[model samples]
Target: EEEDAGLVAEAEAVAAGWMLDFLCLSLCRAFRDGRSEDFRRTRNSAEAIIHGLSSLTACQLRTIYICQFLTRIAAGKTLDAQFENDERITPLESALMIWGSIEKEHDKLHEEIQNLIKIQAIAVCMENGNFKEAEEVFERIFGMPFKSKLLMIISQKDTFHSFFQHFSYNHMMEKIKSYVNYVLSEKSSTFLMKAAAKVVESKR
Candidate 1:
């Protein structure tokens, strides 16, 4: 029983870190494209993570920090760059930075930030067995334009799962596909084409 508990906890932590990384990538994709659907998917993923995983162990914190640090770097912020070169970042410090920075940024993330928090609360409600509220949040997000569209696209990805929290909004995949289709079909933006190629290549 003790071993199982430890393993389960470790799994959850790894899952949390994976979810965070995917979500930040999703957010960057949204920002880069002005794809409201992408942004919606990213926000939903964030809410899911914020609500689902209540606590994380030290290793889990490092996973999250790596992702967050990438987020900063992707967004062109040099805040955590020193840590990239510094081997002194202890596990506790990394975890602190993940939750701490997120907590601080949560408030400053523009007017739409509250909406993401609301999404998190809804996720919490669901996790705590308040199915009614969870269902409502799901339905409400579906009623929204971006999220509703995004659901269709993410379904294509193989490893998408709910255990990590929010990055994989069940319904937002379509928007992702649509964005991909637009890029591939229309060749509308050279930057997006470059990004698509890079994302694919990096995944490889």
Candidate 2:
């Protein structure tokens, strides 16, 4: 990295984000299972590793941002703490960047990332026992053309059982699919999309 003078490419960012995602995944597992000792061990070790190289470039940090959001939740810390009292970047920025690339730059990596985001969110909601939300997240992501793998990457990250259960948000979906439909399909959601697009516009 020193030999490169200033900064590296987005390639490094992807690798870093992948490692961080693993950290966040393990953190969630430990937390959910009440494995306090292992939880703290993984936390300290990986947190130090992540702290070593959290900043690179916007292109790179963009990838990190999404996964970092997962780590933020699992680590029980502020999500935008990456930046301090300044122009903070959110995980939404990473999603926007994907949209940014698709608009013109058009890289295919976004597809892989699209999958990652889906997996990340679903796992979180499931772990937290937000079963309704989890299933809803799975809906928009489940079907697509030219699909490659990981429902191989996400398909079997590991066992995802809750220590305590609401019986999978029992009854909401037991009756039908209405709850899932409105979660992403409401007036709030309409403006929600607009707000996200606005955030992306800031990149200009």
Candidate 3:
């Protein structure tokens, strides 16, 4: 029972990380379009993720808390801007507010990893000439280390676009692979594999 519990805990952590990655990717889309709906969707997805982490430890929960809070603030800013005409008043305030609230609660490595998500979103906005949104990410990284590899990808428009396209395609492939594996594990047909094998045999 103890070993089973440990495995379940490990699986929960992996699931939480995967869900946050999807939300962060959604954040990248939100940054590109500057749409409130995009951020809201991410926040809603984060809420669903949190619902599944009921058995998570304090440290694990903290990791997801940052993700949840970041999306919430990002979404809140979009909603706030709708009614308020003065955009300058709190353009990057949400980033600052959330980072400040969560910084002390988590370790540097944890914070940096979470910050990468925001930075990627910002880089996308910058690539698309959405400097206004990009500024929010910059503000949040005052004392953080910005990776050179990521900078290179984001600095060039073509490179960033290509990277995003590939990243999205790869994510889709991973999901398809996961579903197919699950079906096979449940005793589903090997028809798909057999058909491919038959095609290769005929070609040979």
**CA-lDDT, candidates in order:** 0.44, 0.43, 0.49
- Give a tens-digit lDDT track for model 3, residues 75-190: 43242442124454232344434455553435554454344444444544555566554555444444323455445544453324554464342343243233224323432223
**Who is ahead in TM-score, 2 or 3?**
3
TM-score of every model versus the real structure: 0.31, 0.27, 0.33
lDDT by residue (tens digit), candidate 1, 62-176: 4345345323323221222333344433222232244444422333332233333333324334444545534454454444554543333233232222531553222223332
Q: Rank the candidates by TM-score, best first.
A: 3, 1, 2
- What's the number of clashes in each of the models? 15, 2, 0
Top-down lDDT ranking? 3, 1, 2
Let me know the TM-score candidate 2 reaches against the reference structure.
0.27
How far does residue 168 in candidate 1 sit from its true spot (Å)? 34
Per lDDT, the best of the predicted structures is 3
Candidate 1's error at 131, in angstroms?
41
> Which residue pairs show backbone clashes in model 3?
none
Model 2: residue 138 alpha-carbon error in angstroms: 37
RMSD of 3: 13.6
lDDT: the better of candidates 1 and 2: 1
